[PDB]
């Protein structure tokens, strides 16, 4: 685990997520999707605690699949956030809790609108234009108060967003073996398999 | 051993009558005649003491009840079945209204309480419904004076004036001939004392008849002094005393 | 009405009793048990020809050395299987071994009588357990809902079983090859049956020390239900 | 109808049809009595010799409960095993918490209370023994007889089973003719003739005799049975009587 | 907790209540299943006592399982919804731990074991429900179809209909259905189901639903006017 | 604060040839610097040739053989008095251990 | 012990009916009649009160018409204490729901929840069913207008108009007589009244014996407005169709 | 007719069993009386030991529940013993829990609330006994509770109960219709046991010797039971007069 | 007939028919046999099959090195209440290192039959057994009824037609119990007795099944070739 970004531009949010699994001094892996669509529109990222993370986004994943065969409905990204900010917010105040941190990106079609949202392991819920979770808001957040405009394109988004990635790649102690950049609109969610 | 009784005691017939509480109802027709008339600045309550036996002290059975400070109940039925209904429903007041808002419940959410244990009674396993009608009287800021009629079944209605038990259908038409919406309070008394007289056969006197009021606070009721949006209870139950002074000019 | 566990004037349980009247209704299933395996067949019995007679499952495998064949209220069977699965699993988990047959059927009656007023009600389904282990070899078993199991060197339950029974008295002997006792399952149920037997309506299976418990193709049933007629044919 | 087929189900007399069918099952079993003496109680009891293959002395009935206190009972046998059982555990709370060994009275409310108890619902039965018990406490010796209802009394003589009007009798006659006390050693001879000739009541089958007894004197306030020597010289002293 | 066993024995060795739980099957409204070729198709009988209904709204008899199995059912409407919630469950819980879409087998003997509980645990009684269970295993092209009942058994069917008058619709499809040639296509199978009710119903209008499942969860229910052709086509071709 | 494990000391020894096998240990049995007792067996016959020891804290090691006799005697009577082989009188000893992973018996064991 | 007395609520006829559910029904069937009809442009929800007295308090009394959130109101039929109980879980639902995903409860998911509640009690638990039938008049962003029906079994069905209560056959006729599809709001008020009307046991339909509400979008741009009619409102609206 | 078995009401709104209940109580055919002095609460009952075998000195229907309140039962001792350990229980824990003697009345509300709950409770029937609670409370002073089935209480000025209850009851009556007054204007307890054994001879007809009756006297602080020799020295008394 | 619906049910002469008709199915089992001397104990038992083609149905069964015992009527019912018994006998050796003395066995069967005969919803067992054992004070055999009551005696015999075997034992009495230090004369004797409940059928080889415990002897069973010496 460790960086996750999402950025929403006028009609898409683009989540980037890193690909490195270190344990100990060995990096396991360098391929790792830290991500799990929820629903066609709706798309969750993951960072926190190992194993807690994976089972916590499957979790969700579950829930929200059993309501749409349930409704043969959608739920809004409004409605999924809440949903997953309550499971957080319960989870703070149990014998164990789920030490883990997402942001939640989907596409609103009943409003036609992307939508941001940045959940911590509390329950800490917030929309935003551009979002981060861990160290790497110590960084990005700054450059995108620069950079963003509320009026970008998904392209404007992701040359933005290699603006980021080249900082945190400068920047940043560890290694994190890039990352895998997914885009959610009125079209649904796909992978940019160059970055 | 253990409750092996889960299952309900009342059940529909294929006529679509529930048995247990249309049998409840039966017993609170034999219940002595209890009545409520409302007026515009305050609500009484009327009901007679049959004594089980004259060496019995009728003073140490009250059939009367204060509830809250502004609410008061009276009955027709089984006795012991709105004793322990008493009981319950004051302790409802209390944990599910005023140890969450600081205040007493309004008039018609605490019949709703009560109505709903009388509910239960009909639903729940291994029990009998109660054997009651309840008349609660009652005042709040809100809604002002109100009177409610609930039954076994836990049906409750709002009234201007009624009555339940033994002579009820006689008593409820001397009310519809009596009552007007410029009643005031002392003019509603005098009108109870009337309708009740027809019910009861012995002696009619301050002794054998038990009659509260919900009215204007009571300061002199309070116990103390000091608080000024504290002003006393609204519930006051009228001695055998006042009651023969209106009896003489009857 | 009355209690689930109720004594008849007679000593015996009704609830018992009236399910074995059950167990009469069903299919017919039969065991045979020799020196060289263990013979299990049924008779499927379709109720409608629409039905895909190849999914009726009334032959089961428990464990690689354990086989089992039903008759009756088969649903009820499920839960008796599944218990018998965790048992030799378990059996394994705990010990790394295989689990005795009789140790098996012991465990699966010990399901039997619990119910009453637990389960609502006793199983509905009489089950053949056959298998083999190093102590005692070859084993078949009858288990019932009144928690009882015999060992039996050939059984048959269901609605045809006093007339199988009766002939398997006469044809059975210490001696019986496992083609033997193959040809004597197919000829007994071909006797009992309704509808006429052939290899979509009846299934065989066996359990050997070598190769384990083994359902029976319908091809490979075929050939002997045609060597069967040759042979009763030819004398 | 249908009163009697439910336990606690009032009649319309006000009676519980199924204690009172209890009460059938104690009048059917064997006799069993108790002696209340001058510093002590005595406990006797009939048993019926079904077999020659019956080992003599080894089907013992008459039970100890803590160490003081001696329980026989008459009817089911079972029943009565279950109540004592019970009577231990009642026993050995009250010591726990208290010290002190139970007294006899406290001990029989116990007994009485749990009794009792399998009256007030439908999904128990009554108990189908009267059981006879007493012992000796700081306020000295007490005799007390408990039934299927709960009733239990204290008793200066007590019997129950198929004989007990004729050991009623028999009781009755002691009392009077000895206001001042009856001994222990007394009434374990006492207990014995009135056992043989509560015996007239089911002499079928011939029978074999057992007693106990708590005394301060004699057996130190603890509950002891009666063998060899002391219950022989007792059988001797009742079959002189018969004849 | 209430105990009592109400799913017994009888001295002929019958469960009554099981029995009396397949009554309710036999009211309910006429269900049928037919596997072609290449697809299943599911029909529901609706019937027309009810007028002003609101068909947008009104629980359809036809349910989504996962994306690629379909239940439908005859009998007590309230039970099927029970049965069809700790369906869509398990299916979900497989998902999550088999990584995998569950198999029409499994997704039916789950169902079927639910329904076998309820014969034989206190307190409770049967479901008054017979289901048909249908669809494609994962990365899979034979096409399944299984029915259950209260009971809890359950088998494999080429075709199979469940409901009242379904002995009449049973019969038409023992004669019109041949295994060594099932409905080729989509339209073949469409046809031999709508045939097969029409048997039963009364009108072709709003009394007949019918459902078509293609490999690779392609699920889709036809509307009016699509039913309403093959009701016009199949009249036309019986005045012979 | 209580501490529920303690030391008894004491060593054991366990070698096996063609057609048998010995299992050794001393008699000894020690807390801190002191002698609990100079002959104090913790090597035992369990039945069907099984000889096993529980080497460590001794109220551990007592009971896990108690244990482990006791489920040679429970073998018996659930599987028609079958003879426990080694093998699977090994597997019995892993599972009566690991039952106890969160508060351990502090011995080691050898039969 | 207690099996002598236990009724067995939850078990089928030899026909494969559910005894309970059949006799709650028909308990139903004497409750006063409440009518609801979907227009486009609303839902008008109208209940008949049972036999009243002149000395009952006429204006803060509610016997049919409960509200369940700012969208959703149901009428009820049947016993008044069983629809109270399961308004208050119904109530508690729909702000579960909120609570939750911070959106108001879609219709159907809180009348699928009512009724499975009642399905439960026809199923296990040995307890007798609950004697109410709802009508459910609401609205959400997905169907818009709704009216649906829930009953002792547990089953539900949606309607564009609907009765339960007393003489449904009578009055569902009358329904499906003068309803069309095109129907406005005020239109549908009318028709409401007319059937009970003539429907009625009563001599003739007064204010006094009437409970009226109506769901419209006519608040101020797009939001929707629940009216429970006051008594002076009744008495206007029963003027204003030449009805009194 | 299984209506008539637990208590759930009959078709013209009654409860058989607890009707029954009320017939259980005179099973003793024993008598009880309670009256009231200026300062002590006097209960009186009949005591009859019919076999000879029995220990008379405990066969008792007086309990004394606490150091303040007595109670006597009619009805059946298993009963009438379940009846007085709860109602000592009761009387214990709201001594613990309140801090103050509970309340002869409110220790009869108590005991009249549980016997309610079994009229309504299916798998509990109700005790086939009248508990009559006796004190000297230490705000109303005299007092007489009594307790039935039913779950009805009531306060008496005096009260009887049994089979012969009525012509108890009236002779009462005629005598505080004579008086004028609510007690017996009697200065010492002593006194006020005369009154009551004289006017149950009176009205059951029946001379007493000293083994039976059993008597149970209330003043401040402290309630307890006579001896035989107490009562034979009070029967001596009425009879000098 | 109205008062046999349950065990909690008295009938109004007193009687439980419940526990009556559980007594009937032991009349309904087939014959066991017990007896013992002053140095050991032994059982006898005629096994049941199904058919020429089944099992002989075990009757007995070891409890612990010094106890087991002998079952007639309802099989599962012994299997559960031996269970209990091969417990309770466990429990004394774990915890106190003593053996179960057969006298407190029997009190512990009583007990646990018992209150199955006293509540709503169960049922009493439906099986008879013949305990016996060798303890600190000899030899012992019991029989146990599951109306509870347990009785110790020298020699008995339960189930179809065991009133044969109990009148040879009655006669035999002096005989057998002088029987010391000497099993196989003792299992004759035992033998002797279960040949007079015989009818039709005699002792085989796979139909005769023997158990004895005694001073220097486990409870072993005999079953098979085994037997062939006492036929
Ligand atoms: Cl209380």
């Not at chain 3, 009820?76 to 005795?100: C, F, G, K, P, W």
């Not at chain 3, 070859?138 to 339950?157: D, V, W």
């Not at chain 4, 206190?69 to 279950?82: A, E, F, K, M, T």
């Not at chain 7, 499975?116 to 638990?125: L, S």
Request: glycine fraction near 8%.
């Amino acid at each position: 685990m460790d960086i996750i970004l999402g950025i929403r531009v006028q009609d898409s949010v683009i989540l980037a997520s890193s690909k490195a699994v270190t344990r100990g001094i060995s990096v396991l892996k360098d391929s790792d999707d830290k991500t799990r669509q929820l629903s066609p529109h709706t798309l969750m990222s993951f960072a926190g605690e190992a194993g807690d993370t994976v089972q916590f986004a499957e979790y969700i994943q579950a829930n929200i699949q059993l309501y749409s065969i349930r409704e043969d409905y959608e739920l809004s990204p409004q409605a999924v956030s809440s949903f997953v900010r309550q499971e957080l917010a319960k989870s703070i105040r149990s014998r164990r809790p789920y030490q883990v941190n997402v942001l939640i990106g989907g596409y609103d079609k009943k409003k036609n609108k992307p939508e941001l949202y940045q959940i911590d392991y509390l329950g800490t819920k917030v929309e935003l234009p551009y979002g981060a979770h861990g160290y790497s808001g110590f960084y990005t957040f700054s450059l995108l108060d620069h950079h963003y405009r509320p009026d970008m394109t998904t392209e404007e988004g992701l040359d933005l967003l290699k603006l980021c990635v080249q900082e945190l790649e400068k920047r940043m102690p560890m290694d994190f073996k890039g990352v895998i950049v997914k885009i959610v609109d009125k079209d649904g969610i796909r992978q940019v398999d160059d970055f | 051993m253990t409750d092996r009784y889960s299952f309900s005691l009342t059940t529909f017939s294929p006529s679509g009558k529930l048995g247990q509480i249309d049998y409840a109802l039966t017993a609170v027709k034999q219940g002595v005649t209890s009545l409520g008339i409302k007026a515009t600045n305050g609500v009484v309550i009327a009901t007679e003491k049959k004594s089980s036996s004259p060496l019995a002290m009728s003073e140490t059975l009250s059939k009367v009840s204060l509830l809250t400070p502004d609410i008061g109940a009276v009955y027709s039925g089984m006795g012991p079945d709105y004793r322990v209904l008493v009981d319950k429903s004051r302790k409802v007041a209390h944990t599910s209204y005023k140890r969450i808002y600081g205040e007493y419940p309004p008039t018609k959410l605490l019949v709703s309480e009560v109505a709903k244990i009388m509910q239960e009674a009909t639903q729940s396993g291994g029990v009998r419904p109660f054997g009651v009608s309840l008349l609660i009287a009652g005042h709040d800021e809100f809604n002002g004076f109100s009177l409610y009629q609930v039954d076994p079944s836990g049906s409750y209605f709002p009234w201007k004036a009624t009555a339940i038990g033994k002579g009820s259908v006689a008593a409820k038409t001397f009310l519809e001939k009596r009552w007007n919406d410029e009643l005031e309070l002392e003019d509603a008394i005098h009108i109870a004392l009337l309708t009740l007289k027809e019910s009861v056969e012995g002696e009619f006197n301050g002794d054998t008849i038990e009659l509260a009021i919900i009215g204007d606070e009571n300061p002199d009721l309070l116990g103390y002094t000091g608080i000024p949006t504290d002003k006393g209870p609204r519930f006051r139950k009228l001695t055998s005393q006042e009651i023969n002074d209106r009896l003489e000019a009857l | 009405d009355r209690g689930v566990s109720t004594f008849s004037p007679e000593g015996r349980l009704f609830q018992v009793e009236y399910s074995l009247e059950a167990i009469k209704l069903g299919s017919t299933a039969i065991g045979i048990a020799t020196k060289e395996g263990v013979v299990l067949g049924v008779e499927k019995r379709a109720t409608s020809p629409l039905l895909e007679s190849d999914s009726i499952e009334k032959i089961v495998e428990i464990d690689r050395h354990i086989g089992c064949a039903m008759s009756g209220l088969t649903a009820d069977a499920r839960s008796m299987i599944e218990h018998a699965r965790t048992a030799a699993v378990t059996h394994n988990l705990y010990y790394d071994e295989d689990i005795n047959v009789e140790s098996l059927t012991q465990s699966v009656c010990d399901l039997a009588l619990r119910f009453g007023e637990l389960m609502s009600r006793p199983f509905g389904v009489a089950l053949l357990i056959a298998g083999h282990d190093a102590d005692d070899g070859y084993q078949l078993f009858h288990a019932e809902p009144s928690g009882t199991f015999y060992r039996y060197n050939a059984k048959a339950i269901g609605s045809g079983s006093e007339g199988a029974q009766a002939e398997l008295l006469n044809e059975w002997h210490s001696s019986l090859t496992l083609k033997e006792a193959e040809l004597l399952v197919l000829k007994i149920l071909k006797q009992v049956m309704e509808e006429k037997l052939d290899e979509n309506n009846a299934q065989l299976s066996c359990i050997t020390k070598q190769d384990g418990f083994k359902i029976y193709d319908n091809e490979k049933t075929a050939e002997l239900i045609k060597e069967l007629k040759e042979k009763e044919a030819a004398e | 109808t249908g009163y009697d087929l439910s336990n606690s189900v009032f009649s319309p007399d006000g009676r519980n049809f199924q204690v009172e069918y209890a009460v059938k099952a104690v009048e059917n079993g064997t006799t069993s009595i108790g002696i209340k003496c001058n510093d002590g109680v005595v406990f006797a009891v009939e048993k019926l010799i079904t077999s020659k293959l019956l080992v003599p002395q080894k089907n013992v009935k008459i039970q100890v409960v803590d160490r003081h206190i001696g329980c026989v009972y008459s009817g089911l046998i079972p029943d009565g095993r279950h109540l004592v059982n019970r009577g231990r555990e009642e026993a050995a709370s009250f010591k726990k918490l208290y010290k002190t060994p139970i007294p006899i009275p406290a001990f029989a409310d116990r007994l009485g209370q749990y009794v009792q108890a399998h009256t007030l619902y439908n999904s128990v039965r009554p108990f189908g023994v009267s059981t006879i018990f007493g012992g000796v406490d700081k306020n000295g010796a007490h005799l007390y007889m408990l039934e299927p209802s709960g009733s239990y009394w204290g008793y200066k003589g007590a019997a129950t089973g198929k004989g007990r009007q004729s050991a009623k009798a028999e009781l009755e006659k002691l009392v009077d003719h000895h206001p001042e006390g009856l001994s222990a050693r007394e009434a374990v001879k006492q207990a014995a003739k009135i056992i043989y000739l509560a015996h007239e009541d089911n002499k079928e089958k011939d029978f074999e005799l057992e007693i106990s007894w708590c005394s301060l004197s004699e057996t130190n306030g603890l509950h002891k049975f009666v063998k060899g020597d002391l219950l022989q010289e007792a059988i001797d002293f009742a079959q002189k009587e018969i004849n | 907790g209430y105990d009592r066993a109400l799913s017994i024995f009888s001295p002929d060795g019958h469960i009554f209540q099981v029995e009396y739980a397949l009554e309710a099957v036999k009211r309910g409204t006429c269900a049928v299943g037919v596997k072609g070729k290449n697809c299943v198709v599911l029909g529901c009988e609706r019937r027309s006592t009810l007028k002003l209904q609101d068909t947008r709204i009104t629980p359809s008899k036809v349910s989504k399982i996962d994306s690629h199995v379909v239940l439908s059912f005859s009998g007590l409407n309230a039970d099927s919804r029970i049965l069809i919630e700790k369906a869509r469950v398990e299916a979900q819980s497989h998902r999550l731990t088999l990584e995998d879409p569950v198999t029409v087998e499994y997704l039916t003997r789950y169902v079927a074991g639910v329904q076998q509980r309820y014969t034989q645990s206190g307190g409770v009684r049967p479901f008054g429900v017979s289901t048909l269970i249908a669809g494609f295993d994962p990365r899979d092209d034979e096409p399944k179809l299984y029915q259950t009942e209260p009971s809890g058994i359950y088998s494999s069917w080429s075709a199979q209909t469940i409901g009242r008058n379904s002995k009449t619709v049973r019969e038409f499809l023992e004669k019109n259905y041949d295994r060594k040639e099932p409905p080729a296509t989509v339209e073949e199978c469409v046809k031999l189901t709508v045939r097969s009710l029409l048997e039963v119903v009364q009108t072709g209008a709003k009394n007949i639903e019918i459902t078509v499942v293609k490999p690779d969860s392609d699920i889709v229910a036809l509307s009016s006017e699509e039913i309403n052709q093959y009701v016009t086509q199949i009249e036309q071709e019986k005045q012979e | 604060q209580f501490n529920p494990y303690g030391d008894n000391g004491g060593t054991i020894l366990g070698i096996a040839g063609e057609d048998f096998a010995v299992l050794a240990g001393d008699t000894r049995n020690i807390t801190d610097y002191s002698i609990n007792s100079r002959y104090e067996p913790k090597v035992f016959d369990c039945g069907d040739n099984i000889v096993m020891s529980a080497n460590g804290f001794a109220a551990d090691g007592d009971a896990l053989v108690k244990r482990f006799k006791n489920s040679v005697k429970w073998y018996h009577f659930d599987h028609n008095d079958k003879k426990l082989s080694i093998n699977s009188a090994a597997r019995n000893i892993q599972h009566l251990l690991y039952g106890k992973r969160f508060f351990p018996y502090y011995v080691h064991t050898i039969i | 012990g207690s099996r002598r007395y236990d009724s067995r609520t939850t078990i089928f006829s030899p026909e494969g009916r559910l005894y309970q559910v059949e006799y709650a029904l028909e308990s139903i069937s004497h409750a006063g009649t409440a009518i609801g009809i979907m227009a486009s442009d609303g839902i008008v929800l109208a209940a008949e009160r049972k036999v009243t007295s002149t000395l009952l308090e006429q204006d803060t009394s509610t016997e049919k018409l409960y509200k369940l959130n700012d969208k959703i109101a149901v009428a009820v039929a049947g016993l008044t204490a069983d629809a109270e109980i399961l308004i208050n879980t119904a109530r508690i639902h729909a702000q579960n729901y909120l609570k939750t995903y911070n959106e108001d409860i879609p219709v159907e998911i809180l009348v699928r929840r009512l009724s499975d509640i009642k399905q439960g009690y026809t199923q296990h638990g040995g307890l007798r069913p609950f004697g109410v039938s709802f009508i459910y008049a609401g609205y959400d962003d997905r169907y818009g207008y709704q009216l649906y029906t829930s009953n002792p079994s547990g089953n539900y069905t949606g309607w564009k108009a609907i009765s339960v209560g007393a003489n449904t056959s009578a009055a569902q006729t009358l329904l499906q007589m003068d309803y069309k599809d095109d129907m406005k709001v005020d239109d549908a008020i009318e028709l409401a009244l007319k059937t009970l009307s003539k429907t009625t046991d009563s001599s003739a339909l007064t204010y006094d014996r009437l409970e009226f509400a109506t769901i419209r979008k006519g608040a101020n741009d797009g939001e929707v407005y629940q009216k429970i009619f006051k008594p002076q409102e009744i008495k206007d609206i029963l003027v204003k169709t030449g009805i009194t | 007719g299984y209506d008539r078995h637990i208590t759930i009401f009959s078709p013209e709104g009654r409860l058989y069993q607890v009707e029954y209940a009320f017939k259980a109580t005179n099973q003793t055919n024993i008598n009880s009386l309670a009256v009231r002095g200026k300062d002590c609460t006097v209960v009186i009952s009949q005591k009859k030991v019919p076999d000879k075998l029995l220990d008379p000195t405990t066969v008792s229907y007086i309990f004394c529940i606490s150091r303040t309140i007595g109670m006597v039962v009619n009805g059946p001792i298993p009963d009438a013993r379940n009846a007085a350990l709860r109602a000592k229980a009761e009387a214990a824990e709201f001594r613990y829990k309140y801090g103050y003697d509970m309340p002869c009345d409110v220790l009869a509300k108590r005991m009249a609330n549980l016997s309610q709950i079994y009229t309504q409770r299916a798998y509990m029937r109700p005790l086939g006994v009248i508990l009559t609670f006796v004190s000297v409370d230490e705000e109303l002073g005299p007092s007489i509770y009594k307790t039935d089935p039913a779950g009805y209480y009531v306060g008496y000025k005096a009260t009887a109960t049994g089979p012969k209850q009525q012509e108890i009851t009236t002779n009462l009556e005629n005598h505080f219709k004579k008086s004028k007054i609510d007690h017996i204007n009697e200065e010492s307890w002593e006194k006020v046991v005369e009154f009551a054994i004289t006017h149950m001879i009176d009205a059951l007809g029946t001379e007493f010797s000293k083994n039976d009756l059993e008597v149970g006297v209330a003043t401040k602080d402290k309630f307890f039971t006579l001896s035989a020799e107490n009562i034979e020295e009070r029967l001596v008394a009425i009879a000098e007069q | 007939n109205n008062y046999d619906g349950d065990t909690v049910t008295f009938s109004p002469t007193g009687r439980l028919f419940q526990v009556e008709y559980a007594l009937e199915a032991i009349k309904q089992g087939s014959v066991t046999v017990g007896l013992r001397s002053n140095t050991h104990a032994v059982l006898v038992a005629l096994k049941r099959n199904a058919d020429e083609l089944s099992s002989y149905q075990k009757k007995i069964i070891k409890c612990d090195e010094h106890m087991g015992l002998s079952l007639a009527g309802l099989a599962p019912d012994a299997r559960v209440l031996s269970n209990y018994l091969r417990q309770q006998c466990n429990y004394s050796s774990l915890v106190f290192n003593r053996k179960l003395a057969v006298e407190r066995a029997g009190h512990l069967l009583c007990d646990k039959a018992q209150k199955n005969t006293q509540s709503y919803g169960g049922r009493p067992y439906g099986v008879g057994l013949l305990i016996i054992g060798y303890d600190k004070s000899g030899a012992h055999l019991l029989e146990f009824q599951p109306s509870g009551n347990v009785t110790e005696l020298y020699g008995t015999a339960i189930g179809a037609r065991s009133q044969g075997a109990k009148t040879y034992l009655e006669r035999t009495l002096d005989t057998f119990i002088k029987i010391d230090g000497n099993p196989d004369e003792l299992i004759k004797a035992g033998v002797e007795a279960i040949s007079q409940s015989l009818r039709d059928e005699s002792l085989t080889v796979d139909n005769l099944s023997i158990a004895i415990v005694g001073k220097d002897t486990p409870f072993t069973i005999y079953d098979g070739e085994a037997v062939a010496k006492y036929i």
